[PDB]
Design a protein around this ligand. Structure first.
Ligand SMILES: C/C(=C\CC/C(C)=C/COP(=O)(O)OP(=O)(O)O)CCC=C(CF)CF
Ligand SMILES: C/C(=C\CC/C(C)=C/COP(=O)(O)OP(=O)(O)O)CCC=C(CF)CF
Ligand SMILES: C/C(=C\CC/C(C)=C/COP(=O)(O)OP(=O)(O)O)CCC=C(CF)CF
Ligand SMILES: [Cl-]
Ligand SMILES: [Mg+2]
Ligand SMILES: [Mg+2]
Lengths: 297, 295, 284, 295
């Protein structure tokens, strides 16, 4: 099989993983309109709350659950969208957006509508200012869930630059800041721009490495594995390995940029905690990619 | 510095290296026109025959000197071109091409001319049939020594496919077939087409990796390219490219076995495919030592 | 030899152009060589870009451009990012301008007058403007092919600054729900503006990143030859724009505000062309 | 539908077109094993010798038939290859090569085998020198008919650079020189490198413009690539590309004038570049009329 190269990074989980998993999972099991029982067992087996704790281990104890709820519903909605058309899904989420802003009261008879309205109302209660900060990142993501992918020849360079702007990863960085109470200033973010780009790249390639077998079932393939294999003319497996070393090079560069950021006296306490959180998203994303059933054939 | 990742390929120097060295080196130490003495000293150190012996280890004991000669003169000529222009250089070699075919005569007063003539007459003398096989390969190559790079940005893929056609690595393969008395038939060579590209690509990247510093002083190299596309330092890029070379090495082996499974292959190809394997490991050792890449 | 191919897009000019031009030019030419020329046609471009702008807002746009144009180039130590960055806080009004340095109180007053006419929409242009100003002062690049460049330009900031400034000029209120519906049309439009720009500014910018150089290399033809091919490509995007607008309408997603928005984008393209040809900024 | 933009070039056919066709047709009509009758009917419809007179309208009267025969057999062999695997076809043509060289006699009982042998035996008999001059161009093509295309992300520039090296266009140019009796020296050919690359792109793109739909059933053409990089329809890409083709026609005229103004144009090159012009004009008409692209 495939062996991951040496890494100075290691996966961690949020301390309250078990308590939150129970809480959040419980809520949805009683509120979410699940199809049959096999579905409820498939939901618990997924442990979305646990996935979230693996991504945001350094999240505040009284905030980690918000993230678990947020991602949980996003994962669920993403599954529903699978059985819908771009027109349907687009309209579906576009409706939940005003409900998320809290500018439209939900139809209490529809689960997803009040779960969303409630989740955001709850969030604004805990921290109005920061809760508003993640509104845009979330919608940007939601709208992207139903966007049509334009196919065009892309070399490794173009592909990687494209992933640097991935909205899913942008959502994770903004959600992580919320779960950690990190209110970074405009100057501080523009200060870690390279770090973010590098990280977003890491997360994506790691996903490509383990999601390849899945996507290669085409019964519109956009992945670094495919691109690196054709450009270097090697097998997909050969490309996966090469891509993995590249990822370690991005971990190194991360440490370099973090050292540079500090050496220049620009590492405020927040950025310190932030760039650390990012290190855990990278290691967390890797363990997840290696186990999640989403990538299972 | 840079630590090369594990390889199952091992270099090998041709046994007669030391003798063919004294021989060939001498031939040029009296015939070729060297400026002063410093030129000669350096020349000795460069050890072109040694370099050749590292690339063609399995070369027939009574043919290894030919190669050492062919590459010593090209290495020599190439060096002179660094002081000539695209018009001057293109003609310089363009003039030597006919004489090489034997269709023209070598002005005996002109070192380089009779050496090339004598060199070839000698080769057709040993093996007329094969001494010709490497006429075009050498020419197509000589003319390439004076071309002007075109203006089009290349990505990793474009650069690699481009290196799969490298005229130089093509010359090597041909000069090796000659040094090993391997008369491959057209149907065979094509059967190893992918094997030639994968190899040429391998030789070029290893070269890039060790020649980066040198070239960097003013660029078409896999190091700068991957460094820009992946957005990492040149060093990080070298490490990645090196691992990539190991994949090409593993691929080579597969291209070799696959060649026999779907129909075992003649001793010629079987031998040739092995010769290619030695150029790869040979080139690596060279790249790590040749002063050509030193500052 | 540059004979623009046929186009169905007809450029419009704001009827108050003459009025506002002298009005606006007469301003900076008081609060700012022996030359100063004008011949550039700043307020003139604005009027070609936003011909449907509201009569009482058209001068605002001319001022924001007459200043942004005197900055993009003109006054611009290849990292004088401190110059621009020192004008953002002022723009928001969080810092007062030294009545001595024109470029300062010009920005201040300018923005203060924009909020006073309409705060909401005035604040909305802030970010789009800063993003433009923050953009390009040198931070660019890796290997760029045609497709990469056009894709890069589909998300151009200046092109984003125009749509922003345009909505403010016409008093067009659009929700992200509606803007999201016109992403394709925006990307397409942004390309048209950038390539036309590249075609006529090739000489000036050459005195680099431009579709003219790239196509010339990839097709291996001269710059002028590339300009002609690029022009035909612009006519295709014009056709695509119409098709996209047709679709927006049929898909029942067209709303009055959106109907005006698209048509306005058409004006920027046609206007951008007429201008680029005449403007002595690229030495006609 | 698709209206071709203005052009200063015009298609031209060879005068002996009617006689050559008759001659070349009858020959194959009796020596070539046509499955039934439906085939012979189709065969005549193709007008292979008529296609040749369109591409080489300036061919010598006593040579144009050599071209028609050559293309006809290649066309036919291309069709039979469609019913063979890569390994099959590769071995099929790999056998006709040693035969074309005249090095191995044909099995007179197998049509394709003795039709090739005799053809080359004939050509050498008319101009041994030039005949051998085009052996490699033909073999380079034949071996490409059974090649596996390596798919990789490719932009416009990459695709065009690749087409400049198209073996088919190389064959037409080589075959054209043979048909026109133009023995170009190495210096002359090197002198028209750009011109050949420019023309090679032109023929290749015009083909793509008209073979798109055909290939658009259930991969590697300038149409799909430009449409995707510019985000326009394939139909629009075709209109843009056509204009580009006129630009290349312009480039051709300017390269000839410069090549002339620099005193580098010879009587042979003059006839050659004009021959390429008609190759571009002819290829365009063919692309619009051949049934090879229909449905
Ligand atoms: C992005 C996250 C939550 C967003 C909610 C959802 C449904 C994310 C899943 O969207 P994608 O995974 O990007 O499409 P994909 O499966 O890759 O073809 C946290 C981690 C999820 C990942 C999914 F890839 C990876 F980090
Ligand atoms: C195929 C030959 C040698 C193989 C060893 C190699 C890779 C020689 C390298 O030839 P170069 O194109 O100049 O790359 P470089 O920047 O000098 O390292 C013949 C020697 C030819 C020369 C001129 F081509 C001498 F450099
Ligand atoms: C270049 C030649 C003729 C010019 C007519 C042309 C442009 C034929 C081109 O047919 P293609 O659509 O390019 O598919 P191909 O890969 O060439 O089989 C002689 C080669 C003979 C053929 C017969 F099979 C090739 F098409
Ligand atoms: Cl030209
Ligand atoms: Mg500018
Ligand atoms: Mg410009």
């Amino acid at each position: 099989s495939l062996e991951p190269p040496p890494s100075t990074f290691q996966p961690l989980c949020h301390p309250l993983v078990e308590e939150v998993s129970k809480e959040v999972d419980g809520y949805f099991l009683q509120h979410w309109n699940f199809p049959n029982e096999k579905a409820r067992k498939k939901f618990v087996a997924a442990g979305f709350s646990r996935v979230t704790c693996l991504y945001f281990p350094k999240a505040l104890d009284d905030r980690i659950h918000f993230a678990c709820r947020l991602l949980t519903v996003l994962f669920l909605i993403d599954d529903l969208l699978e059985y819908m058309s771009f027109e349907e899904g687009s309209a579906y989420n576009e409706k939940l957006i005003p409900i998320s802003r809290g500018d439209v009261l939900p139809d209490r008879s529809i689960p997803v509508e009040y779960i969303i309205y409630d989740l955001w109302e709850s969030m604004r209660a805990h921290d109005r200012e920061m809760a508003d900060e993640i509104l845009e990142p979330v919608f940007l993501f939601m709208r992207a869930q139903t966007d049509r992918t334009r196919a065009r020849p892309m070399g490794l360079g173009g592909y990687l630059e494209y992933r640097e702007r991935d909205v899913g990863k942008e959502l994770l960085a903004a959600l992580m800041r919320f779960s950690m109470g990190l209110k970074l200033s405009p100057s501080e973010l523009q200060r870690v721009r390279e770090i973010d780009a590098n990280c977003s790249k890491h997360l994506s390639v790691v996903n490509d490495i383990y999601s390849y077998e899945k996507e290669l079932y085409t019964s519109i393939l956009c992945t670094s594995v495919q691109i690196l294999a054709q450009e270097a003319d090697v097998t997909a497996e050969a490309a996966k390995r090469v891509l993995f070393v590249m990822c370690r090079e991005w971990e190194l560069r991360h440490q370099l940029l973090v050292a540079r950021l500090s050496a220049e006296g620009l590492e405020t306490p927040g950025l310190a905690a932030y760039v650390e959180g990012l290190e855990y998203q990278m290691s967390g994303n890797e363990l997840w990619s290696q186990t999640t059933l989403r990538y299972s054939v």
